[PDB]
Amino acid sequence: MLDAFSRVVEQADKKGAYLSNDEINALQAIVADSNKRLDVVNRLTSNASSIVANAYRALVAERPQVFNPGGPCFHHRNQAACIRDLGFILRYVTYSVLAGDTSVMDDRCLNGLRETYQALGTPGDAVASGIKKMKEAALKIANDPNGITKGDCSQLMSELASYFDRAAAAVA
Amino acid sequence: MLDAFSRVVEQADKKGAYLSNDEINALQAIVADSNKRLDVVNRLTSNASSIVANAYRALVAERPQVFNPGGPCFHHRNQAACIRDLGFILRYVTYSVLAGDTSVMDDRCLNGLRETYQALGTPGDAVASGIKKMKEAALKIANDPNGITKGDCSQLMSELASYFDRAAAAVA
Amino acid sequence: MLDAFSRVVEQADKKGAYLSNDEINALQAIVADSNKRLDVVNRLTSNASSIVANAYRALVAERPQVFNPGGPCFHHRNQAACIRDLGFILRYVTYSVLAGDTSVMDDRCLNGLRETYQALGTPGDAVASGIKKMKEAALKIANDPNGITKGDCSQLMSELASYFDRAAAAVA
Amino acid sequence: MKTPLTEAIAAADLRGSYLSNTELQAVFGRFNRARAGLEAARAFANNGKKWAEAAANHVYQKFPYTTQMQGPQYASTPEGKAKCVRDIDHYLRTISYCCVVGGTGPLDDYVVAGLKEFNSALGLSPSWYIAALEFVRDNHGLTGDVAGEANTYINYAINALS
Amino acid sequence: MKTPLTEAIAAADLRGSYLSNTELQAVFGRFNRARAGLEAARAFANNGKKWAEAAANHVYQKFPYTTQMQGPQYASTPEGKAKCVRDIDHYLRTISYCCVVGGTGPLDDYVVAGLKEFNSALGLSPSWYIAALEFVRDNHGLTGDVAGEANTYINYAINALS
Amino acid sequence: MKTPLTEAIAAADLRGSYLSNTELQAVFGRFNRARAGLEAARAFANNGKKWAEAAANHVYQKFPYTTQMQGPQYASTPEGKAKCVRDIDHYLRTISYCCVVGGTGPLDDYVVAGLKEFNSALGLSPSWYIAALEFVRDNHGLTGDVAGEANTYINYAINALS
Ligand SMILES: *[C@H](C)C1/C(=C/c2[nH]c(/C=C3N=C(/C=C4\NC(=O)C(CC)=C4C)C(C)=C\3CCC(=O)O)c(CCC(=O)O)c2C)NC(=O)C1C
Ligand SMILES: *[C@H](C)C1/C(=C/c2[nH]c(/C=C3N=C(/C=C4\NC(=O)C(CC)=C4C)C(C)=C\3CCC(=O)O)c(CCC(=O)O)c2C)NC(=O)C1C
Ligand SMILES: *[C@H](C)C1/C(=C/c2[nH]c(/C=C3N=C(/C=C4\NC(=O)C(CC)=C4C)C(C)=C\3CCC(=O)O)c(CCC(=O)O)c2C)NC(=O)C1C
Ligand SMILES: *[C@H](C)[C@H]1/C(=C/c2[nH]c(/C=C3N=C(/C=C4/NC(=O)C(CC)=C4C)C(C)=C\3CCC(=O)O)c(CCC(=O)O)c2C)NC(=O)[C@@H]1C
Ligand SMILES: *[C@H](C)[C@H]1/C(=C/c2[nH]c(/C=C3N=C(/C=C4/NC(=O)C(CC)=C4C)C(C)=C\3CCC(=O)O)c(CCC(=O)O)c2C)NC(=O)[C@@H]1C
Ligand SMILES: *[C@H](C)[C@H]1/C(=C/c2[nH]c(/C=C3N=C(/C=C4/NC(=O)C(CC)=C4C)C(C)=C\3CCC(=O)O)c(CCC(=O)O)c2C)NC(=O)[C@@H]1C
Ligand SMILES: *[C@H](C)[C@H]1/C(=C/c2[nH]c(/C=C3N=C(/C=C4\NC(=O)C(CC)=C4C)C(C)=C\3CCC(=O)O)c(CCC(=O)O)c2C)NC(=O)[C@@H]1C
Ligand SMILES: *[C@H](C)[C@H]1/C(=C/c2[nH]c(/C=C3N=C(/C=C4\NC(=O)C(CC)=C4C)C(C)=C\3CCC(=O)O)c(CCC(=O)O)c2C)NC(=O)[C@@H]1C
Ligand SMILES: *[C@H](C)[C@H]1/C(=C/c2[nH]c(/C=C3N=C(/C=C4\NC(=O)C(CC)=C4C)C(C)=C\3CCC(=O)O)c(CCC(=O)O)c2C)NC(=O)[C@@H]1C
């Protein structure tokens, strides 16, 4: 497991040299917008349940075959196991926004998730569609003008988007 | 694990439709001859020890190289391990006649039994010969006229034969 | 696990014949020089720490890149893990001289050691160089004229050399 | 899945032996009640889709809010009603499987396993289904042992739903 | 397999270290008795096949039924007698291996491991073998330490057979 | 490795949930002291290589034997001195990483993990390094919170070294 800082430190040690001035300033920028970064991490945590529920609802509304008698995701056993999985992806996406790094998600989650769904007969292109919808919402919630100090938490959305997109690609 | 009934139910759910009338009658036939089916399962259970012992005796009488100094099955350690294995096959064959289904044998036993014997250096074509002899006896015992009500427990022998043949093929 | 004796016994059983006269004399030779064989096993055990320490020192003096910032063997974590590994090889080499057989080393150590170092990014050709140096010393120590009864513990050195060389080849 | 035959086999495989006399009777007595179970699953086969619409109407009168409130996960729209008749059918369809199998196997793996984690995560309520499931238990109107088998598994789903 | 050398190595590998002074002596003292063991295995090498027929006759007189009863697993037929001389030889052959190895390793893995599960599953009886094995223990007529090594492993097979 | 951010994530993954309010504050309060840590790692970046030669001389005066005795693992030869300035630098370099990370992660995995097993196996002594490490702790001469962060991790290496 690595974070935004511990990752640059690892890059500095591999060359046996201290963290350059330009690198000290880079992480310095990460700290400067930490408040915005935390608000992002906090708005996803709160609206966690809603995001994965609607992402599931829209996914079954887009692919009714998969969740019906015959499809891979039928039975209460599998129905609850699909929501749970989307919830997992969202949890690690949130972990990554906190750390400013995608390692936690890559190891603990994405690692062998492509082969897993494959060895179970899960569409994969259906899970990716569940993540892309789970993304649309996450951006709308995490970037709401009401209740927060006005500003431009821009580079957070772009980063948030890179995490979701990374997860969806890792299964499809 | 699945049985004669639970398997048709699984086929009905995969299409999201009830068990058709023609399917209700099919299993109805299975129940009608259950008494004969149980007698088969009970005569093999009783004469279990005899069947695997003679199957071993005839197999060593047909292949003396395998059970001598040099052959794969030498040493009391391996000698008892061969009988034990034949006993296993017979036990699951009996399980299948009870369930009217071959799933229990396919999973719990046949699953990776082909690779097992292979990774240990067991002839495979010798084990199959042990099962084919273990079959001849099983049919003679399970289908004896004395001590049982006269009738035609025919389709049971054919089924019994399909289980033994299935097991022998799965190793050779 | 097998030793010099138990290995010939295994060869005799595979043919279902007693140990021939010429084989009784062969092992008889092994017992005749056991005292020399034990002295070899005892001089390596004593000078164990020195051998692996100098082998490490010379190896870092021959390959400074590997043990510096960037190289595979940097960090106290990996630095101590390299000495420890050389120590392992030496321990099993000593075990083999005692048993007069190389089985213990082949199973407990060399088994999957080639793939291990590979899956971790260890040079392999560096470990082999550490063993070749660890050998030069082992021969000098185990074959010192002082403190021991004079004689010709020749075939022990040749055997000692075959064990070290076997280990080094098994990783490079 | 779960059935007295498959079950008796498992409890014998664990002991590393064949079936005991205490188990042989359990499997032998299964086939004795088997005819009633199949005839029960035959009843659902015919007038089973009919009980779906019948039970779908019952739940609406028990809980009026299910067909008037918003449109997130309620049977307000005609689209949501089609899902209510669908969901009830899945229950009746699975219950008939329990009659063929002679055990709560189907319900255990199909509807019970993962029941709550799903329902109480999508806004659906057990009371809606239990209500429309108790309806069928009375209105199915089966004979004797055929009605016995059907009820044993209809009420089972009610226990897990509560 | 099992031998004081291979054994002393295992008990050292577990500790993650070399041999202790308490073990070094155990291996050092092995080579001291090694000459008697090899000379014992040399005795079986020569007149070892002879003791097979000699012991095969002894068991017939001890248990007359072994050569008169039916033909399932008895030495009644001349074919079954060839297997009796064969089975006794396997015992003597393995016992000599224990002398070369200096431990009950061979007997442990070759004849002892799986002894009962096989015998008492094919109708064979231990009493037949023990009887013909006690015969050799007396009639082999070895010297001193050579006879000591041979007996230590001849009687061992008798302990496991009982 | 180890950092309040990476740590707070792990202690949340174990619970199979998101971050708690008790943890959210721990990560939120990390960024508050982050500026002092980075400025500390900035000090080592510049005059960090200088403290290496400065500390290398200090240890020689504390322990004269390190530069006069034999040549196995001492700084007697000019070659060994280059390794002493190198070894001290590795300590200072890693300590600055602890300031960027805001935790003893770097020291834990880089220098602490496997410290003793190596040193006390190659003849090197902790006292040499601790002495030259205590030197820097005083002579670095940093301001306030920048000096606080630097010292918290300079003395940490001293604790593990002892
Ligand atoms: C009828 C009592 C009422 C109606 C219920 C309702 N359910 C859904 C959505 C779903 N229903 C199921 C049912 C199952 N799937 C299974 O695999 C099994 C076990 C075999 C069951 C019982 C599922 C999986 C869903 C989710 C997928 C889907 O959207 O269909 C809806 C739709 C609302 C929504 O999408 O959340 C409705 C309306 N509603 C009522 O108010 C009833 C009284
Ligand atoms: C002699 C005491 C008498 C004779 C014994 C008898 N044994 C068998 C059959 C077998 N004997 C063995 C022996 C071994 N195989 C091994 O690997 C080992 C350990 C190294 C031993 C000791 C085995 C494996 C068999 C089974 C295979 C075979 O059929 O040869 C028979 C033949 C009867 C049968 O086939 O069951 C006999 C007659 N019988 C007596 O009555 C004796 C006194
Ligand atoms: C300076 C205090 C003095 C000097 C010390 C000294 N050390 C070595 C050899 C090594 N030093 C290290 C250091 C590290 N490698 C790492 O990965 C880490 C953690 C990041 C550290 C701290 C290592 C690995 C070695 C061994 C490899 C090598 O030979 O360089 C020497 C050389 C002597 C030898 O080869 O054994 C010396 C001289 N000596 C003193 O007396 C000092 C006061
Ligand atoms: C980006 C998604 C939106 C945005 C955010 C934004 N956030 C701040 C500053 C703060 N964020 C705080 C959040 C936390 N973290 C906690 O643990 C916690 C519990 C008390 C809170 C409230 C926080 C405390 C601050 C500082 C005080 C404040 O609320 O202003 C700011 C202002 C700039 C800054 O970095 O301080 C913004 C702009 N701004 C947007 O436009 C997006 C909608
Ligand atoms: C086919 C192998 C042979 C054959 C069998 C056959 N079996 C029956 C009927 C019964 N079988 C019973 C067996 C059991 N199961 C038990 O657990 C148990 C303990 C009490 C018993 C005795 C059984 C009770 C019956 C019914 C009573 C009876 O014995 O008749 C029948 C008759 C037809 C039927 O299905 O009932 C047959 C014919 N018939 C053959 O020809 C084969 C040799
Ligand atoms: C070969 C490396 C060198 C050599 C060795 C050599 N060794 C002996 C004989 C003995 N070795 C003994 C060693 C042990 N083992 C113990 O556990 C132990 C504790 C008491 C000791 C001392 C040992 C006891 C003997 C016998 C008595 C003795 O020391 O002489 C011999 C002599 C020939 C023989 O096999 O006995 C030699 C020559 N000789 C060399 O030239 C090599 C340097
Ligand atoms: C829902 C979006 C889609 C879907 C998902 C689905 N998942 C399973 C079962 C498993 N999912 C995983 C994956 C993980 N396990 C983990 O611990 C983590 C994070 C650490 C992940 C990502 C695993 C291992 C399983 C198997 C074990 C288990 O059940 O937990 C299923 C069931 C597959 C089946 O056929 O039984 C399904 C269906 N299914 C869909 O249709 C959606 C597209
Ligand atoms: C006898 C007919 C033949 C024969 C058999 C033989 N088997 C083994 C050892 C093993 N057999 C199995 C297979 C199973 N394990 C199970 O649990 C089950 C059912 C659930 C099966 C089918 C396994 C796993 C082993 C290895 C572990 C063990 O010993 O139990 C051997 C020994 C192989 C060796 O070389 O040591 C043998 C010989 N050998 C013959 O010659 C007959 C043809
Ligand atoms: C030193 C000569 C070289 C070197 C070695 C090195 N080893 C590791 C880590 C491992 N080594 C092993 C191998 C064994 N484990 C055993 O138990 C045995 C004997 C029974 C052996 C031979 C294993 C399994 C590991 C991994 C687990 C562990 O750490 O114990 C490393 C670390 C690799 C890394 O990148 O982290 C190294 C470096 N490295 C060198 O440069 C020398 C050539």
PDB file of C-alpha atoms and ligand atoms in Angstrom, chain C residues 56-57 60 74-76 79, chain F residues 59 66 72-75 80 83-84 86-87 91 110-111 118 122 124 128-129, ligand 3:
ATOM      1  CA  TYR C  56      29.094 -11.624   1.129  1.00  0.00           C
ATOM      2  CA  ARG C  57      31.925  -9.104   1.516  1.00  0.00           C
ATOM      3  CA  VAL C  60      29.600  -6.802  -2.774  1.00  0.00           C
ATOM      4  CA  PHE C  74      19.652  -2.524  -1.026  1.00  0.00           C
ATOM      5  CA  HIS C  75      18.080  -1.788   2.406  1.00  0.00           C
ATOM      6  CA  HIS C  76      18.937  -3.490   5.710  1.00  0.00           C
ATOM      7  CA  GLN C  79      21.023  -6.870   3.065  1.00  0.00           C
TER       8      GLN C  79
ATOM      9  CA  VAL F  59      32.437   9.449  15.099  1.00  0.00           C
ATOM     10  CA  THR F  66      37.483   3.087  13.950  1.00  0.00           C
ATOM     11  CA  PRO F  72      38.095  -5.935   7.866  1.00  0.00           C
ATOM     12  CA  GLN F  73      35.170  -3.588   8.558  1.00  0.00           C
ATOM     13  CA  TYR F  74      36.678  -0.363   9.920  1.00  0.00           C
ATOM     14  CA  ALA F  75      37.171   3.124   8.472  1.00  0.00           C
ATOM     15  CA  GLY F  80      36.359   2.654   4.361  1.00  0.00           C
ATOM     16  CA  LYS F  83      31.624   4.087   3.142  1.00  0.00           C
ATOM     17  CA  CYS F  84      31.194   5.804   6.520  1.00  0.00           C
ATOM     18  CA  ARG F  86      27.915   6.953   2.638  1.00  0.00           C
ATOM     19  CA  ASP F  87      26.259   5.033   5.489  1.00  0.00           C
ATOM     20  CA  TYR F  91      20.381   7.557   7.443  1.00  0.00           C
ATOM     21  CA  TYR F 110      14.636   0.777   4.853  1.00  0.00           C
ATOM     22  CA  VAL F 111      16.971   0.855   7.862  1.00  0.00           C
ATOM     23  CA  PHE F 118      22.991  -7.397   9.451  1.00  0.00           C
ATOM     24  CA  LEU F 122      29.292  -8.063   9.563  1.00  0.00           C
ATOM     25  CA  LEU F 124      29.639  -3.175  12.404  1.00  0.00           C
ATOM     26  CA  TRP F 128      29.426   4.290  15.774  1.00  0.00           C
ATOM     27  CA  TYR F 129      26.243   5.346  13.997  1.00  0.00           C
TER      28      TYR F 129
HETATM   29  C1  LIG G   3      30.867   4.791   9.451  1.00  0.00           C
HETATM   30  C2  LIG G   3      29.949   4.917  10.691  1.00  0.00           C
HETATM   31  C3  LIG G   3      31.890   3.711   9.645  1.00  0.00           C
HETATM   32  C4  LIG G   3      32.208   2.614   8.683  1.00  0.00           C
HETATM   33  C5  LIG G   3      30.987   1.724   8.431  1.00  0.00           C
HETATM   34  C6  LIG G   3      31.115   0.688   7.341  1.00  0.00           C
HETATM   35  N1  LIG G   3      30.020   0.059   6.794  1.00  0.00           N
HETATM   36  C7  LIG G   3      30.462  -0.843   5.825  1.00  0.00           C
HETATM   37  C8  LIG G   3      29.650  -1.703   5.019  1.00  0.00           C
HETATM   38  C9  LIG G   3      28.247  -1.540   4.791  1.00  0.00           C
HETATM   39  N2  LIG G   3      27.449  -0.443   5.179  1.00  0.00           N
HETATM   40  C10 LIG G   3      26.137  -0.698   4.763  1.00  0.00           C
HETATM   41  C11 LIG G   3      25.075   0.240   5.008  1.00  0.00           C
HETATM   42  C12 LIG G   3      23.745   0.148   4.604  1.00  0.00           C
HETATM   43  N3  LIG G   3      23.276  -0.545   3.479  1.00  0.00           N
HETATM   44  C13 LIG G   3      21.965  -0.358   3.484  1.00  0.00           C
HETATM   45  O1  LIG G   3      21.196  -0.817   2.646  1.00  0.00           O
HETATM   46  C14 LIG G   3      21.547   0.475   4.629  1.00  0.00           C
HETATM   47  C15 LIG G   3      20.179   0.898   4.972  1.00  0.00           C
HETATM   48  C16 LIG G   3      19.582   1.783   3.839  1.00  0.00           C
HETATM   49  C17 LIG G   3      22.698   0.767   5.302  1.00  0.00           C
HETATM   50  C18 LIG G   3      22.816   1.575   6.516  1.00  0.00           C
HETATM   51  C19 LIG G   3      26.097  -1.989   4.093  1.00  0.00           C
HETATM   52  C20 LIG G   3      24.924  -2.666   3.494  1.00  0.00           C
HETATM   53  C21 LIG G   3      27.401  -2.508   4.109  1.00  0.00           C
HETATM   54  C22 LIG G   3      27.824  -3.804   3.537  1.00  0.00           C
HETATM   55  C23 LIG G   3      28.198  -3.697   2.060  1.00  0.00           C
HETATM   56  C24 LIG G   3      29.530  -2.981   1.916  1.00  0.00           C
HETATM   57  O2  LIG G   3      30.594  -3.650   2.044  1.00  0.00           O
HETATM   58  O3  LIG G   3      29.520  -1.742   1.681  1.00  0.00           O
HETATM   59  C25 LIG G   3      31.875  -0.784   5.756  1.00  0.00           C
HETATM   60  C26 LIG G   3      32.830  -1.537   4.906  1.00  0.00           C
HETATM   61  C27 LIG G   3      33.451  -2.760   5.651  1.00  0.00           C
HETATM   62  C28 LIG G   3      32.855  -4.091   5.120  1.00  0.00           C
HETATM   63  O4  LIG G   3      32.877  -4.324   3.852  1.00  0.00           O
HETATM   64  O5  LIG G   3      32.369  -4.919   5.968  1.00  0.00           O
HETATM   65  C29 LIG G   3      32.299   0.175   6.697  1.00  0.00           C
HETATM   66  C30 LIG G   3      33.714   0.500   6.897  1.00  0.00           C
HETATM   67  N4  LIG G   3      33.286   1.828   9.368  1.00  0.00           N
HETATM   68  C31 LIG G   3      33.565   2.385  10.562  1.00  0.00           C
HETATM   69  O6  LIG G   3      34.408   1.964  11.357  1.00  0.00           O
HETATM   70  C32 LIG G   3      32.707   3.585  10.790  1.00  0.00           C
HETATM   71  C33 LIG G   3      32.720   4.468  11.996  1.00  0.00           C
END
